[PDB]
Amino acid sequence: HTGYVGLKNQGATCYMNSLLQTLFFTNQLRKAVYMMPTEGDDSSKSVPLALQRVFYELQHSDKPVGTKKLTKSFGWETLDSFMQHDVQELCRVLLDNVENKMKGTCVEGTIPKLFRGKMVSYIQCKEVDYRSDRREDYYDIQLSIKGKKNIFESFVDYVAVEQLDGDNKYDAGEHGLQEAEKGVKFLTLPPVLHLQLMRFMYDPQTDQNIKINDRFEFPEQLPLDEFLQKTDPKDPANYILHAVLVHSGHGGHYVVYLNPKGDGKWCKFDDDVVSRCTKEEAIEHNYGGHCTNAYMLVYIRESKLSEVLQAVTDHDIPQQLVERLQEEKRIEAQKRKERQEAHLYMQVQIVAEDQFCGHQGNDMYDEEKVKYTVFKVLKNSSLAEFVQSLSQTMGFPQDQIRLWPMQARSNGTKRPAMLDNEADGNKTMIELSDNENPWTIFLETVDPELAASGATLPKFDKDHDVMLFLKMYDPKTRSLNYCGHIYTPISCKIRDLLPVMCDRAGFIQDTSLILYEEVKPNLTERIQDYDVSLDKALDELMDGDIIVFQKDDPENDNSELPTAKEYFRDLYHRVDVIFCDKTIPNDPGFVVTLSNRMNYFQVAKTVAQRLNTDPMLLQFFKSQGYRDGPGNPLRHNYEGTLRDLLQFFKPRQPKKLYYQQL
């Protein structure tokens, strides 16, 4: 009913869409494609079956047709896998493919029948009698456009005889070097003529990739009778224009104009929208004129078009295809259903206080090492419902638990932070997560030792209390110790918390303590006045803030790392980096421990101690970052630091620099 159907434009498929429609409306070819015995073939790797699928859906679908399995099928998936090849290469790919799959069937030899033409490449000597000929079969013709006005002129140029003169002489076997002519002449022109215009070429010294938008004309009706060796009455070489393929403007948007019926009723096929157009919009408007411009044309022989554009109906398609493809469509329908179910649920990752114990770095834990209890939960389900689900699964009373969602902060520290169960209990999980795809929540419980007895998690005044996390630094062992969390009124003076810090650390009451806010990695700010409220003591006080404390003792000074400040500083600089020998390909390399604040001299000196060698006999190479492999050489008067060099490495990605000896 609703006219013609379009293709979707999926990524950088590009000219593929334009080309498919052009082949689909070559009806003789299409009917033959429907005959290919594909019932035994692989669904997503059979190019013949994939192309059959596209044609079937082009013929039947109300919705634009996908090339999801087809692009996979012939193996050009990535954005530029197309940009690599030209249209004519894709044409021979698909045509050769179906041609060979029809061998052993009733529709064998359809592709030569429709597209094969014959041409002679010849050389003939002037003075001596010698000739050298070459009979060649073509499935298309490439026509030059620069210097030209119309396609008639490009055909005059293509048949043009070339003169072999002084210093270009032709060596004709025994006769030797002689003056000669070299010509190209067409023996036959097929029912379907593909003409590729040389709009753009990879001509360097001007540009690796380019475009020629200069004006270039082509007719509705093309007479070729004069460019053939042989002519025959009732079969002239008069051709009707069938298709016009177009590009505009880097790449740019591809679109195609066809008159499927051969009756001059043209349509603009721009991917998913098809529309009717005038002949001007198909031909006149795509000549150049300096934008949008025609790069490939398809003509059909005036006698042959009744055959070539045979009417096609549903029946011309075997039930072997109909039923198979319809089952594929049911499958895809399930897959769509599965996918939309999976989109409705979210993943909540619960972490418990045990996971915080023993962590030696900044923040609560290590992202790569932490162990979660995970829950699939409806995105639109309630908080209270999840709290019951958690309490049932985990084995707790709801009044003995509290959820603190892990909130990633502005300065790049991830920490537990408050949720008001009282006010936010009725909201959805997905809105409460602010769409964090996997929800990460810290689960506070009552000390299980007290759980048996009368023990509920205490009241938390969301306006006037804060939850802080405590960490004890030991200089002697240069280690961190998680000392749990506490609730406290904000108005509390830091001093009033010292007794409990001492106690959790196993220190003696009235032990003299140095306190720091662990703010951010490499930022460990000393709390200088203990007699002020938490509010004044910390800057920007917040649930999930961390205080690190240590004994104030002369003995600290004898350690490598006397303070928690120095500890965290060292933790932030200490970097292990892999050194790979550039001269040994597939070298895994060897790791060295360095500091992000090391200069060239220090880096080289250090690696040279490891390789027995002189630093002057090491040449290092800069990283290309996300692209693997060595980059430009590292000059020995490089001013920056190891930090500056490694900044293109991704966080989870391990670091490596390439080098060589001298």
DSSP, residue by residue, 425-473:
TTSBHHHHTTT-SEEEEEEEE--HHHHSSS--PPP--TTTEEEEEEEEE
What angle do the packed helices 15-24 and 87-101 form, to 10 degrees?
40
Phi, psi of 349 (to 5 degrees): -100, 110
Please tell me the distance from the alpha carbon of residue 114 to that of residue 27, in angstroms, as a whole number.
11
| Contacts with 193 (C-beta within 8 Å, 6 or more apart), sequence order | 117, 141, 239, 298, 299, 300, 301
The method recorded for this entry reads: X-ray
Please tell me the distance from the alpha carbon of residue 360 to that of residue 362, in angstroms, as a whole number.
7
The CB-based long-range contact list for 576-579 (8 Å cut-off, 24+ gap) reads 576/654, 576/655, 577/642, 577/646, 577/655, 577/656, 577/657, 578/654, 578/655, 578/656, 578/657, 579/607, 579/656, 579/657, 579/658, 579/659
Please tell me the distance from the alpha carbon of residue 596 to that of residue 603, in angstroms, as a whole number.
10
Question: Which residue has tokens 């013929």?
Answer: 59
Catalytic residue among 1, 91, 247, 253: 253
Within 102-241, where are the H helices?
110-115, 151-159
CA dihedral for 418, 424, 429, 435, sign (positive or negative): negative
| Contacts with 287 (C-beta within 8 Å, 6 or more apart), sequence order | 215, 216, 217, 218, 293, 294
- Identify whether 14 is a catalytic site residue: yes
Q: Are strands 630-634 and 180-186 parallel, antiparallel or unpaired?
A: unpaired
Residue 131 forms beta bridges with which residues? 124
Phi, psi of 24 (to 5 degrees): -50, -40
Q: Are strands 117-125 and 180-186 parallel, antiparallel or unpaired?
A: antiparallel
Q: Are strands 414-416 and 292-301 parallel, antiparallel or unpaired?
A: unpaired
Tell me how many degrees the CA angle 86-195-77 measures, rounded to the nearest 5. Answer: 20
| Contacts with 661 (C-beta within 8 Å, 6 or more apart), sequence order | 581, 583, 611, 613, 617, 618, 619
**By C-alpha distance, which of 631, 639, 636, 638 is closest to 657?**
631
CA quadruple 20, 22, 25, 28: dihedral, nearest 10: -90
- Residue 431 in contact with residue 419, Cβ under 8 Å? no
Query: Which amino acid makes up residue 143?
Result: L
Phi, psi of 70 (to 5 degrees): -75, -45
The single-letter DSSP state of residue 654 is: P
**By C-alpha distance, which of 24, 10, 7, 5 is closest to 298?**
24
482: tokens are 């998680």
Inter-CA distances, 397 with 353, 391, 448, 451, Å: 17, 6, 11, 9
CB neighbour burial string for 616-632, b if at least 16 within 10 angstroms, e if fewer: eebbbbbbeeeeeebee
630-634, strands of its sheet edge to edge = 590-595, 574-581, 655-661, 618-623, 630-634
Question: Which residue has tokens 């001298």?
Answer: 662
- Identify whether 483 is a catalytic site residue: no
CA quadruple 209, 211, 212, 216: dihedral, nearest 10: 130
Q: Are strands 266-270 and 254-258 parallel, antiparallel or unpaired?
A: antiparallel
- Residue 38 in contact with residue 32, Cβ under 8 Å? no
Q: Are strands 177-178 and 170-171 parallel, antiparallel or unpaired?
A: antiparallel
Please tell me the distance from the alpha carbon of residue 292 to that of residue 297, in angstroms, as a whole number.
15
45: tokens are 């790797």
Say how many CA atoms lie within 13 Å of 202 toward its Cβ.
5
Catalytic residue among 1, 14, 194, 267: 14
Residue 387 burial (CB count, 10 A)? 17
| Contacts with 599 (C-beta within 8 Å, 6 or more apart), sequence order | 638, 640, 641, 642
- Residue 73 in contact with residue 81, Cβ under 8 Å? no
- Grouping H, G, I as helix, E, B as strand and the rest as coil, residue 106 is coil
Residue 205 — left, alpha, or beta (φ > 0 → left; ψ -120 to 50 → alpha)? Answer: left
Phi, psi of 38 (to 5 degrees): -105, 0
Please tell me the distance from the alpha carbon of residue 420 to that of residue 402, in angstroms, as a whole number.
10
- Residue 516 in contact with residue 525, Cβ under 8 Å? yes
| Contacts with 148 (C-beta within 8 Å, 6 or more apart), sequence order | 154, 157, 216
Residue span(s) of the chain under CATH 3.10.20.90 come to 458-573, 574-662
**By C-alpha distance, which of 274, 322, 312 is closest to 5?**
274
- Residue 578 in contact with residue 556, Cβ under 8 Å? no
Please tell me the distance from the alpha carbon of residue 512 to that of residue 393, in angstroms, as a whole number.
44
Burial of 132 from C-beta contacts in 10 A (0-12 / 13-18 / 19+): middle
**By C-alpha distance, which of 461, 436, 457 is closest to 447?**
457
* 167 CA to centre of own chain: 53
- Residue 312 in contact with residue 30, Cβ under 8 Å? yes
Please tell me the distance from the alpha carbon of residue 69 to that of residue 54, in angstroms, as a whole number.
9
Q: Decide which of 3.90.245.10, 3.10.20.90, 1.10.760.10, 3.10.20.600 is the CATH code for 458-573.
A: 3.10.20.90
Q: Are strands 590-595 and 574-581 parallel, antiparallel or unpaired?
A: antiparallel
Regarding the domain delimited by 574-662, which CATH topology (the fold level of the hierarchy) does it fall under? Ubiquitin-like (UB roll) (3.10.20)
CA dihedral for 269, 271, 274, 277, sign (positive or negative): negative
Say how many CA atoms lie within 13 Å of 410 toward its Cβ.
1
- Residue 171 in contact with residue 177, Cβ under 8 Å? yes
Inter-CA distances, 5 with 59, 264, 267, 331, 348, Å: 8, 19, 11, 23, 44
The DSSP string of 510-576 is T--EEEEEEEETTEEEE---TTSBHHHHSSS--TT-EEEEEE--GGGGGSSS-SHHHHHHHHHHEEE
| Contacts with 528 (C-beta within 8 Å, 6 or more apart), sequence order | none
Inter-CA distances, 352 with 257, 383, 401, 404, 443, Å: 64, 18, 11, 10, 5
Question: Which residue has tokens 């200088």?
Answer: 528
